[PDB]
Each structure stands twice: as structure tokens, then as C-alpha cells.
């Protein structure tokens, strides 16, 4: 149980979008920052103190290397970041002729305050190109949370009132071929010099989002810290039914050098490493079955935030049916004694 | 001796049922292929099996009633195999005249023929082979269908190509004669039926626990088969199996049944209390479903026990109605069991298909385990009831 609060900043020399999310509880605070200057980006800040604020300076951000920090420097711990640096056009017309990627740096993202509404705790990012995405573009859907619960959307996750949601989609696209395969290039940034470890977990319960039993994870440290999580599925149409599975695939983490991906100014402001970038491609779908040809839009869901990653909990229904199933052998032992008398 | 120690009748009995268990899988063996003949979509092609399952319960009940009342045990087989051959030849005629409702009408006869022949075979084997070596004839009856179905599936496909290469390339109407060359199996059933009738002519010179046994049969045979019918999709998601090697798991509860059931049939009658065997088989089935559903252990182990617990429940449960209801009434009880089992399977296939996408996969296993638990409860209740009277 923690509070929520949104806030936006604009600069007179050059207005741009900036959404800052603050969650405060008893003795812990979170400092999600969502910037879309050139690329979309996320930076996490954890403070053991219950009071902490930001210090913005648009003058430095106007080769910027300014400081965007918090006053309690001693409370700084586990600062991490993600950068959705590129969108990859994967073709593989036979089973794959890598059409040149679209750079997520020349998009004129719309005003946040137009779509922001604290009642539902959501915001929209939509950039469009300057030269594809003629009608509509990527639509990022950031969302905070207040209490533990389960969303009603067809991709059902388990938020712990301490994480965020990043339903990402793009509406309206003209493919460069008669095939559907899209990809994103997630580039993490570990606080310490190491390689983040990605694993794969197995779950018994399948009441939620049927036909999948795997719950991916990505931990920046073997300790209480931040974590990624997403069910390996992707939906293409609003009535997200079991038909449109469209499986997604991960990759292996590399250690790429600088200048291989565009640099987000927000990350350079929060950090000073800019050399330990680790990126992995993230494809959607396969030519095996249903793809992205009938519709014009692809949706994905994932979490982000610090805390203990939820696993699953069995629902009362299956537990009760198991209980009544176990009643059958026990019932006769009562009945057997009845005939015994 | 009486009839050469039952050897010739045992040999003839197993070969009687090629009329129904051979030509049943023609559309399954001819999946697609005939789709491009004139025009066929997937939805329509399932009507070739709906007529074999839905208009069956009342018709098989009527057939059993006729066997009990009018026809008698002797002439039941000869007329029902005649219905089988009539259905097969009219199916061939519908193939040769290119009409589809002629094709569809064949199933309206072949279904009654097959089910009535099965019930007549069961009651006849019970009537004659009683006393010694009783559970074994059910073993061969079960094994024959599995040893014939795959052979037909391969042989019809091979003969299609053989006839296409030899006779020539007609206007793709050769499937009619292809069915006709497959129709030759049904005549053998007629010959066996007349031979059996001749031998029988020369040879001459309800209650409470029955309902419980019906419940056992319905519960087990409705909680086992649709799980296998589901098959492919579940094992491609719960476990990581290749698209090709996954067919070994789904199709091993059948291929291990026929080479094993005669052994259990031979073993059970020799010093065997049937109730104990049935209880052990049902407990094994429950353990197998629990292991498969609630743990990630190797599916080979969990699916191996199902083969034994399905090959042992057969040829060890049906003979129960041989002792409970006396003679002069088997032809109705067996038909009632067949009707209720067929209706249960037909009504639960749709329910499972409807619940699969609506709730997932864990709930399906939960429901199956509940059904098998009810089966075990009724089994042990039958054990409790038999304690008082006995015999
Ligand atoms: C968003 O709207 C506010 C309304 O006053 C304006 O001040 C700001 O410059 C706008 N920013 C963008 C990027 O449109
Ligand atoms: C913030 O910007 C102002 C204006 O350029 C500058 O004078 C000040 O030093 C900056 N604060 C820093 C760099 O901490
Ligand atoms: C928060 O963590 C910093 C780490 O350097 C420590 O110095 C400080 O005492 C901590 N404060 C509380 C209230 O735990
Ligand atoms: C395949 O793509 C070409 C253009 O690249 C297009 O003209 C054609 O209609 C496409 N084929 C189909 C079946 O859509
Ligand atoms: C992703 O795919 C692109 C395709 O051009 C390739 O160059 C790159 O090495 C792949 N991996 C990463 C981490 O970007």
C-alpha cells in the first residue's frame, strides 16, 4: 500500500515531454522518470528515506552533461535504466534480409498533458515520423499502481503496488513485404560492472492467459532489487482472445560498445558510465501460424520496478475442487465404518 | 472334445468384427486428399463422423432390445453385418455417383451396424465362453480393433497410389472403386457370421449393483478417451516437445493396449478377485492423472501407467454384468451400457472443447481428476455393497 503522484515539466526555450512518477509509503520511495527526448527511456531511483525530491535544470539539458539528481545523495541506491533504442524490421521471407531499422529519435511526440489523467493513472506517447507510420504511430501506455490486484485486461499480470506497466503498441503501419515480423531492441544498463542474467521459470497455474506456463524474468542482482517480467505473448487486436497467441522470443545479452545505439540524454544525465550497455533483440511472432496481416496494430505487456517479484497464487476454485476430489476416498472410510456397525 | 477345446470358436470370434473395426477409419485415413475432389471445407468433413456418434444411443438400445426379444442371439450377427455391408456399398455408390448426400447416408446405416455388431459380439462371447477363459475373449476383441485400424490406415493409402499408377489418371473418381476394394473386408464378416451360425446350429445337437457398474463404465470411459482426443495441443504447451516426436506420447496409450490386454485377460480369471483388480486400475489412473497434472515430471512415466490402467480395466470390468444380471437379459443391459457410454462421450467432448478456451488447461485436468475420483468412490461403494450378499 503506497501513494501515487504524477507531475510534468516544460521548458520555455524548447518545450518537450517529461513524466515523473513518485510512489511513497511508510519508509520507502520510488522515483520513476519517463523521458522521451530522443528515445523513450526509464530510470529507477530507490531511497530509504521517506522524503526526497528532484532538481531539474533545463539550462544544462538545452553536448549536455548536466546533473538531474536528488538531494539525499546518501540515500541513492540501485539506479538502473532501460532504453528502447531501436525498432527492427525483421523479414525472413523463407523460414532474414534485415530491412534497415527505424530510428526512435526523430519522432515528434505529442503533449503528455493532453492525455494525462490522474483518475486512471495513465499517459500516452505518440511521436509519428518526419519522413511507415503515416496514420498513427507507437502508443506507449505508462501506468502506475496503488494497491495489490489483478487487471481485467486479457493479458493478466500480478502487480504488487510497487511496480509499473508498459503496454506498448503501434497503430497504423505499412509493411515493406508480405510478411509480419517485428522487433524491439531493449538495452539495459547495470549499476555495477557485470552482465544481467535472464532466466525462464515454470508455473503450474494456467487460469490466467491460457496456453502459457512460462514467466520470464530479468534480475540486475541476486538481492532485493528491480526486476523485469512479461508473459511471452503478444496481441494484435483489441478483443485479445486465445486465438491470437503470436509468440515472442528473447535473445542472449551482449556487451556492446558506445555509439552502437543512439544515446538518450536523460540516461547520460542520471548516469556517467555510458559504456556498459547490454542489449538484446526482441522479436514478435513467427510465420508458423497467425501473424500481423489482417490488423494494423501489435500490443505487448511487461512490468518494471523494484521489490520482490510475484510468482503466482492458486485461486480458491481449483483448491476447492481439489478438496472435494479428496473427499471421495475419505467419505467411504466413514461409510465403511457405518456398515461395520 | 465338445468343440475341440474352444479353439476354432476362439479363432473365429476374433475375426468376426472386421466389418465394423476395419472400415471405420476411412475418412481418418483419407483426411484431406478427397477434400479437393469437388468441394470440401473442414466444417462439413466432420459430418462424416457426427452421424456415427449422435444418432446412436436410441438406435443401439433398439438393436439390443431386438436381439433380446425377436431375433435371438444366433441371427443377430448375420443381419447386423448385412447392415454393415449395405452401408459400405451404398457409401461406395455415393462415391461413384459424385453425390454427397449419398455419401452422408452411408453413415446412418454403418453406425447402427457397428454398434449392434459390437453388442451382439459381446453378449455372444459372454453366453458361450462362460465358465473358463472368460475375461480373455474380451482381450482379443479389444486387441483386434487396434491391430486392424493402423493396418487399414496404411493399406488404403497405399492402394490409392497403387490404383492411380496402375489403372491410370481418371477424373479423380477412382476413390469410389478405392472404397470398393476396401469394401471386400465386410464380406469376410458375412462369411464368418454364416460359419458361426452353422456351428451354433451344429452345437445345439434389474438389480442394484448394475447401476453402480454402469456408473463405473461411464465415469472411466468418459474421463479417459477425451483426454487422448485432445492430444497434440496440450503437450506442445505444458511440455517442450517437437512437432514430430510429440505423436509418440499421444498415441502410446493405444499401441500398448493390444499387445498387453490378452495377457491380463489370461491372468485375471486364474485366481482373481475382479473387484480388487478394478480398484487397483482406477487408483493407478488417478495417480497417473495427478502426476501428469500437478508436476513437471517426465510425461513418459505419467503416460505409461495409463496404458496398463486402461488395458486392465478393459476385459476385467465388462464381465461384471455377466454375473449380476442372469441369462435371457444380457442383450438389453449391454445395449444400455453402450448407449450410456456413447452419450457420455458425445456430451463431454463438446463440454471439454467449450471449457478449454474459456478457462485454460489446469481446470480441464481438475475436472478429469474429479470424474475419476467419482469413479473410484463408486467402485469402492460397489465393493462395500457386495460385502453383505457376496458371490
Ligand atoms: C503542452 O501544453 C502546455 C499547455 O500550456 C504548453 O505549455 C506546453 O508547451 C505544451 N508542450 C508540448 C510539447 O506541446
Ligand atoms: C542550473 O542552471 C543554471 C543556469 O545555467 C546554472 O547557473 C547552475 O549552475 C545550474 N546548476 C547546477 C549545474 O547544479
Ligand atoms: C539510507 O542508506 C544510506 C546508505 O549510505 C545510509 O547512510 C543511511 O543511514 C540510510 N538511512 C536510513 C534511514 O536507513
Ligand atoms: C506481395 O507484395 C507485393 C508488393 O511487394 C504486392 O503487390 C502483392 O499484392 C503481395 N501479394 C499478396 C498475395 O498480397
Ligand atoms: C539485432 O539484430 C540486428 C539486425 O541488424 C543485428 O545487427 C544485431 O547484432 C542484433 N543484436 C543486437 C543486440 O542488436
Numbering used by the authors:
A (entry chain B): 38 to 99, 102 to 134, 142 to 177, 182 to 391
B (entry chain A): 36 to 240, 261 to 446
Give the authors' words:
Here we deorphanized the major facilitator superfamily domain containing 1 (MFSD1) protein, which forms a tight complex with the glycosylated lysosomal membrane protein (GLMP) in the lysosomal membrane. Purified MFSD1 selectively bound diverse dipeptides, while electrophysiological, isotope tracer and fluorescence-based studies in Xenopus oocytes and proteoliposomes showed that MFSD1–GLMP acts as a uniporter for cationic, neutral and anionic dipeptides. Cryoelectron microscopy structure of the dipeptide-bound MFSD1–GLMP complex in outward-open conformation characterized the heterodimer interface and, in combination with molecular dynamics simulations, provided a structural basis for its selectivity towards diverse dipeptides. Together, our data identify MFSD1 as a general lysosomal dipeptide uniporter, providing an alternative route to recycle lysosomal proteolysis products when lysosomal amino acid exporters are overloaded.
We obtained three-dimensional reconstructions for the apo- and substrate (His–Ala)-bound structures (GLMP–MFSD1apo and GLMP–MFSD1His–Ala) at nominal resolutions of 4.2 Å and 4.1 Å, though the luminal domain of GLMP and core parts of MFSD1 reach a local resolution up to 3.43 Å. Given the slightly higher resolution of the GLMP–MFSD1His–Ala dataset, we used this reconstruction for model building. The EM map resolved most of both proteins, including N-glycans (Asn85, Asn94, Asn157, Asn228 and Asn331) of GLMP. MFSD1 is captured in an outward-open conformation where the binding site is accessible from the lysosomal lumen. The TM helix of GLMP is located directly adjacent to the C-domain of MFSD1. Based on the analysis of the cryo-EM structure, we identified a loop region of GLMP (residues 250-263) near the luminal region of the C-domain of MFSD1. Arg292(GLMP) is in hydrogen bonding distance with Tyr416(MFSD1), and the loop is further stabilized by an intra-loop interaction of Asp256(GLMP) with the backbone amide of Ala261(GLMP). A comparison of the three-dimensional reconstructions of both datasets revealed an additional density for GLMP–MFSD1His–Ala in the cavity between the two helical bundles. This potential binding site is located approximately halfway into the membrane-spanning region and is formed by TM1 (Tyr56 and Tyr59), TM4 (Glu150) and TM5 (Gln176 and Arg181) of the N-domain and TM7 (Tyr276 and Phe280), TM10 (Tyr365 and Trp373) and TM11 (Gln393, Gln396, Asn397 and Leu400) of the C-domain. Our combined cryo-EM and MD simulation data provided a structural basis for this substrate selectivity since a highly conserved glutamate (Glu150) and arginine (Arg181) residue clamps the N- and C-termini, respectively, of the dipeptide in an extended conformation.
